[PDB]
Structures are given as C-alpha cells and as structure tokens.
C-alpha cells in the first residue's frame, strides 16, 4: 500500500525566510513522527493560502538532505470564508504497510487547533 | 495496482450547506460503483473553482462512517474562461485489480457534461 | 513501487493552442523518457500559474493515443511574487520499478530554469 500524510502550519508574516523555516519544520516533524525515508515517498503536494505571496513552500524540501529527488509541486488552497490565514498544508504519499488509523498527520504553529 | 477515480459535481448557490450535501452524494456514487473501503484509499483531492468560499468540500468526508481516517486536502481548480462554475472535483487515489478502462468515473448535475465518454 | 514524474514548460502566449501544443509535446517527451505506458498512469495532475485562462492543460491528453482512461485533474500554481510565469507543470503518478534518482523529470521552454538537475 502506499498512503497519504497530511500536514498543516500557519507563518506569521509572509517572508520567504518565515515559509521556508516553517515549511521545514513541519516536514522534519512529519519525518520523525512517521520514519519516512526520501526514497519510499512516491511525491508530495504542497498547498499555501492565498494570502502568501514571497516563495514556494517546496523550495524548504531541498534544504532536507537526501530529498533531492521526491517529486514536488505546490498547488492554491481554496479561500475559504472564516478559514486559517497564511497556512501551509502537505500532503506527502509515502510507501507503507502502517494502518491508516495509525498515521501520525501533524498539525502545527496555529493549525494545532486540528 | 494503484488507480485514481475521478468525479465531478456542481452546486446551484456556494452555501455550506449544499456543498457538503452535494459532495457527500458525489462520494456516495463513487464508493459504490467502484465498491471502494475507506482503507483502500491513498488520499483524495478535492478542488472547487475560485467562485465557491462558504466551507471546504472535504468536511463531508467525515460525514461518511468509516472515511474520518482517509487523507485530505482542498485545492483551487484553475479559472478558464468558459469552465464549469461552482464545480467540485475529486480524485480519489485507490488499490483497486480494476482495469484503468473499467474504472467507473463519476460526473454529476451540470458536471455531466465534463467527460461523456465516461458514463 | 508506484512513483510521480515531474515536468514543466512555458507558454508564449495564453492561448488555447499554444498551451495544447506546448502541454503534449511535454508529455510526449516524459512517456518517451520514462517508457510509460498509459495502463501504468494511476493518475495526472496538471496546474497552470494565475495567468493562463484559455483552456485547461488536461484537455492535451486528448491527443494522446491510449490515454482516454488516465484519470487526470488539474489545478491552479499558488501566486508566488517573481515566480515564472505562464508555467505548465504536470506531477505524473506512475506505476514503476525505475529508481527514484533514476526517473527522468522533463523541463522545457523557459521552464529549464525551474531545476537545472532533475
Ligand atoms: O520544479 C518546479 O516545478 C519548480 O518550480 C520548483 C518547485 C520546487 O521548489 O521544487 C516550486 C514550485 C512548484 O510548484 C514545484 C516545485
Ligand atoms: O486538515 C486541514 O488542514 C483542514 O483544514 C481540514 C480540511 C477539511 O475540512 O476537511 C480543509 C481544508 C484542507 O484543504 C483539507 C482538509
Ligand atoms: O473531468 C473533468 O472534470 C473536466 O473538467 C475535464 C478535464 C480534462 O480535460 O480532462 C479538464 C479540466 C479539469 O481540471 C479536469 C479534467
């Protein structure tokens, strides 16, 4: 099987320095918490708010070592009335044999209210 | 092997309300034509077109018993000029044995008009 | 073990048949460069930045022989300041057995720029 890890994070203000740093916390999270290997990650999707201007959320998997190969492409979040502003959301498709209630998806900064 | 099914629908008024009830019957055709497990789903893509902000479309996967464990996220669909407006689109990631050909991929209300040859 | 392909190419012009043409010939060259076969494609995703407005990229497909069945979808490039513009890119899901460092990724047009090493 290969399965689906979800990831969410909001910056602060819009920097490339804040996306960057942020983007990178929560795939090193993702990381650990999943014991994810770069080779058994088929791709990954990134997705920023509308509001989040200064770089891609995918340039921050190249400063992972030994990702230099997990295909990457970030994509537009929905605007949604009364949703989180400047957040961050992955969804990173892994090969694994875990149970899919047994994934640990990691929401972090203020998407910890999920 | 790994095979993704797709699906389409639209919505006459961007309200929560309707767009959670019309993707929980988008859904509901394509877990039973394609007789899908909540278990053998990779992950699912929602996108709706620029003109829908009232709820994110993936809220009514919950609302399907045995699905609040399958993976998420929400995109934009692209505005081109002519598309189909107020359209919530889906890929579902799926282990299936179906052959890509027998794959029942399903389109709904005005989104019937999206990919005849898929009907 | 199944993997995704990537690949990206610039339009002159928004128009319907620059972006049909510049989008096949895209994916010409990864089925060319990676062997693929369409019964082999779990699915397609294809997004264009927030300046091209004339067709969707999908409707490429079209012209592809074998390839009514690829499940594909796209989506719109997040608006990055400075980002390249009028880009087409594709993150093509594939069933395969070639190593990850081992898939040919594909940038064309202006787009070579985007990864000078995939
Ligand atoms: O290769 C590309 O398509 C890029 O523009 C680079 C990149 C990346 O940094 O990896 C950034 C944004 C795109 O959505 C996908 C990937
Ligand atoms: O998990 C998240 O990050 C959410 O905000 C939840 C949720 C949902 O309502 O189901 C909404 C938007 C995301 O694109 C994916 C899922
Ligand atoms: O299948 C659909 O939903 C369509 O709108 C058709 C189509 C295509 O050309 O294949 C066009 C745009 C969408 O992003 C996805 C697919």
């Given at each position: 099987?290969?399965?689906?890890?979800?990831?969410?994070?909001?910056?602060?203000?819009?920097?490339?320095?804040?996306?960057?740093?942020?983007?990178?916390?929560?795939?090193?999270?993702?990381?650990?918490?999943?014991?994810?290997?770069?080779?058994?990650?088929?791709?990954?999707?990134?997705?920023?708010?509308?509001?989040?201007?200064?770089?891609?959320?995918?340039?921050?998997?190249?400063?992972?070592?030994?990702?230099?190969?997990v295909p990457v492409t970030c994509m537009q979040e929905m605007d949604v009335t009364g949703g989180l502003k400047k957040c961050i959301?992955?969804?990173?498709?892994?090969?694994?044999?875990?149970?899919?209630?047994?994934?640990?998806?990691?929401?972090?900064?203020?998407?910890?209210?999920?």
């Amino acid at each position: 099987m290969i399965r689906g890890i979800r990831g969410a994070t909001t910056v602060e203000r819009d920097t490339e320095e804040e996306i960057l740093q942020k983007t990178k916390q929560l795939l090193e999270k993702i990381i650990e918490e999943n014991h994810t290997k770069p080779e058994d990650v088929v791709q990954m999707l990134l997705s920023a708010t509308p509001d989040l201007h200064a770089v891609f959320p995918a340039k921050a998997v190249r400063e992972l070592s030994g990702w230099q190969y997990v295909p990457v492409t970030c994509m537009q979040e929905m605007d949604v009335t009364g949703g989180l502003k400047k957040c961050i959301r992955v969804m990173m498709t892994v090969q694994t044999d875990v149970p899919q209630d047994q994934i640990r998806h990691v929401y972090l900064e203020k998407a910890v209210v999920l």
